[PDB]
Design a protein around this ligand. Sequence first.
Ligand SMILES: [K+]
Ligand SMILES: [K+]
Ligand SMILES: [Mg+2]
Ligand SMILES: [Mg+2]
Ligand SMILES: [Mg+2]
Ligand SMILES: [Mg+2]
Ligand SMILES: [Mg+2]
Ligand SMILES: [Mg+2]
Ligand SMILES: [Mg+2]
Ligand SMILES: [Mg+2]
Ligand SMILES: [Mg+2]
Ligand SMILES: [Mg+2]
Ligand SMILES: [Mg+2]
Ligand SMILES: [Mg+2]
Ligand SMILES: [Mg+2]
Ligand SMILES: [Mg+2]
Ligand SMILES: [Mg+2]
Ligand SMILES: [Mg+2]
Ligand SMILES: [Mg+2]
Ligand SMILES: [Mg+2]
Ligand SMILES: [Mg+2]
Ligand SMILES: [Mg+2]
Ligand SMILES: [Mg+2]
Ligand SMILES: [Mg+2]
Lengths: 148, 203, 193, 51, 99
Amino acid sequence: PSRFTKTRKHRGHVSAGKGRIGKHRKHPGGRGMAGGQHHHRINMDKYHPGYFGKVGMRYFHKQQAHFWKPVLNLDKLWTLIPEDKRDQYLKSASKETAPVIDTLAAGYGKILGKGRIPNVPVIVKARFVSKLAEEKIRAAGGVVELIA
Amino acid sequence: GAYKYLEELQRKKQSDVLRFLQRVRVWEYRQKNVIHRAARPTRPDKARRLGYKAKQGFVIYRVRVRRGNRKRPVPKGATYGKPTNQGVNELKYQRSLRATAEERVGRRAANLRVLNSYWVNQDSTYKYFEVILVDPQHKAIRRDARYNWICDPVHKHREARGLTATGKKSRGINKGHKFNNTKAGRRKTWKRQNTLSLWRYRK
Amino acid sequence: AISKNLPILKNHFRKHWQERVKVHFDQAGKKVSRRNARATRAAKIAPRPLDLLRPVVRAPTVKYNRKVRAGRGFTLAEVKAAGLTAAYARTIGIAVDHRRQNRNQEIFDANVQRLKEYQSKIIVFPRNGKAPEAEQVLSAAATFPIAQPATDVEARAVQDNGESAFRTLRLARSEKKFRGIREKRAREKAEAE
Amino acid sequence: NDVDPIELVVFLPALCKKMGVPYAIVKGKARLGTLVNQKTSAVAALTEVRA
Amino acid sequence: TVKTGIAIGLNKGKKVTSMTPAPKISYKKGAASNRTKFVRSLVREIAGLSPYERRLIDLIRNSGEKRARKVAKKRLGSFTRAKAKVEEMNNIIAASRRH
RNA sequence: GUUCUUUGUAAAGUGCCUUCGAAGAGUCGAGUUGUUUGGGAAUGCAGCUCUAAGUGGGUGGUAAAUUCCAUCUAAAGCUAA
RNA sequence: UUGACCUCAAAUCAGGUAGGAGUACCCGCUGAACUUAAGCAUAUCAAUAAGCGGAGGAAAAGAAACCAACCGGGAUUGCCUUAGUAACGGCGAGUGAAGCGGCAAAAGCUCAAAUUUGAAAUCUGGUACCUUCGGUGCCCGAGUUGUAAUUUGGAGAGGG
Ligand SMILES: [K+]
Ligand SMILES: [K+]
Ligand SMILES: [Mg+2]
Ligand SMILES: [Mg+2]
Ligand SMILES: [Mg+2]
Ligand SMILES: [Mg+2]
Ligand SMILES: [Mg+2]
Ligand SMILES: [Mg+2]
Ligand SMILES: [Mg+2]
Ligand SMILES: [Mg+2]
Ligand SMILES: [Mg+2]
Ligand SMILES: [Mg+2]
Ligand SMILES: [Mg+2]
Ligand SMILES: [Mg+2]
Ligand SMILES: [Mg+2]
Ligand SMILES: [Mg+2]
Ligand SMILES: [Mg+2]
Ligand SMILES: [Mg+2]
Ligand SMILES: [Mg+2]
Ligand SMILES: [Mg+2]
Ligand SMILES: [Mg+2]
Ligand SMILES: [Mg+2]
Ligand SMILES: [Mg+2]
Ligand SMILES: [Mg+2]
């Protein structure tokens, strides 16, 4: 609110905290990003390297839905299972009746292998999987099923 | 019927018969007034395709329009601005000569409603069109529900608002990605894209 | 005006933007008006659920093809398989979409099934009969909710055949990448002078 | 022979020749109209004739 | 044309039970239509060739089909239209005196 | 709801077999010019020149040739929220 | 010599219609410069201001020559997103959409191209009467260079 701003505190002080020598002028250094190559070059090279120029190849009519591929690491791999059933599947770590985890239905496109999972079989349905994620799932007695 | 033979023959515009007819008719149209009532459609098949019917209340007008660019009407070619706007002689009038033809025809027959128009002829100086108009006051049009839609006041001067075929073509009113600028209206789209939407609970 | 270390901003306010500022002060008024319009429309139409029955439909764009949603209208094939004509369905409150086609037997069967359920759960009043009031329900969508089909079971037996799904994906990608080169190489090898 | 937009009947001699239909170019659409109780007819055909 | 059941590769996509929907009457917008064939043949009989069609025929007879196709591409919009026009012109030539 | 108008051997819908199935031209499209667009070997528009086809045509956001495929059906029209 | 047809006229002919105003919103044309770029010409301001033509209670758009590339969606419009992104740009300053997804509202359709050909079945007007937003009878006329019915691609039509 206005009653807590410093402009209430600058009442009675002639320069309003903007200085007597250098005043509050309109646009002393230009408007917006003016002079990013000439007189703001130091502040552009520092704190913004890479700003000027081109860096790659263009892509006309790019659609992000083509690249939609949310990643889920192995470190959770179990929040996709309901909390109550999680204990029941952690117990009885049998190759038969292994819990099935549809990661695409959970909203993921690629399964990555960051964490480690308990030594219990899990059937993981995924559009894509990392090599190490599949290796850890298989080492846990599970399998990866490719879906689309 | 014969309308299909008419349609196929009219597509052979550089054949001997159509070239002869083109020359004779273009001379006759140049002899007549710039805007004049035509007793009957020169191309009845085209008129039918564009919605004309041989009943009372349907009117054909022939109209002559000067061809070429739109020279900027600035005095002595001086534009008094930045060089990007100094052009005078290569400016193209972002509306069809057909649209100009039917606007002039509607201005002449303001009592009627422009239904459509079609090209009939051209020379180096002029382009020739026949304009199909409907009489909204004729009882044969007020009845005959297939056509009384044009009697509604919302269709007044549809050629002056770009609601005919050439008007919609020049306005770019078509579906798809090639018409993103002008799909629901160019200026309406621009207003929508340049409006700052602020809700009570700011997002 | 490039000051100390702040992100580069792109505030597009260099036009006469204050001439087009829509502040939705009428949010609550428009909500009240929409509810009023729904009430008057329900009262105006005969006992009828305020909307047409909509089909089940698979979304495009694999970002969304994992989900099912209400479509525009039932296909002509679905209506015919449900035993109705398109005009009669349109007059008994079924949305019909002549544009959509059936290439998925699961979706086609689901739409025919929900059409049959709708027919068995609606009562069509006779044109010149009595038809006592039938306690209008306002939402056909709420009465016939769209259900996401089940694809697998909760638990199953591990059937690892040593296929190395990652390797399978790599091989499929490589086969797609080199299909044209190998096709042209086989074409140039089938020259047979 | 006097159909003012001539495209309406230019193909008619050739259509009749191709279909083996005897055709005659005659003077007067007004005359054909008086034949058929119209102002003009631009055509007039006999398909069936009496014995 | 069946999908492979995986999200990558040549025939990528989910395996679904196909139906082969009934053919629409659209997709036949340029159909054969004996009526139009007859009318177009008669119109081609009564109206002769355009000047550029006559020049294309003379080019086919004198300078060859490649030169004729180049000139037809210049006259018409595209190379496919040029190919079709040259094919129709050489069909006309075949049906002409050198039957 | 009410009662005379009772339309009408009229109109409409439905299955099977067979033959067909007409569908818009100085228009699409192309070149060039100008303008415009985020549209970039050219987004739309317009002027001039050329000017189609019918298993065709348009689109498929890198120009072109060749081979496929996918998806609609322009150059005519009405319509409430 | 008469009677037509076509085209073009005239009438203070019979009946109608247009102009102009308003113009917030809406459909188009035309169209800047100040400004920003710390100068300035491309750019920006802006496809804006000013000027011109044209409607309504909304207008416009609208039932794909669409989006997509999917297990495919399915008129148009509007909101939330996409997204300050793809892309454009002395690639400088700046600019900058679209598909999908959730929602609001939902609505679908019709002409041309068909031989009614065993019957112009169609329509304006005048007149008389009547139950007068019109109907019936009669009479000119329009119309076969095509007015009705039948079909609009989702189809549909001709036969059994
Ligand atoms: K200062
Ligand atoms: K100026
Ligand atoms: Mg002090
Ligand atoms: Mg001071
Ligand atoms: Mg008349
Ligand atoms: Mg000019
Ligand atoms: Mg069409
Ligand atoms: Mg301009
Ligand atoms: Mg409209
Ligand atoms: Mg008078
Ligand atoms: Mg006015
Ligand atoms: Mg200013
Ligand atoms: Mg400056
Ligand atoms: Mg300055
Ligand atoms: Mg200066
Ligand atoms: Mg203004
Ligand atoms: Mg008013
Ligand atoms: Mg409203
Ligand atoms: Mg409207
Ligand atoms: Mg359609
Ligand atoms: Mg849509
Ligand atoms: Mg973001
Ligand atoms: Mg701009
Ligand atoms: Mg019928």
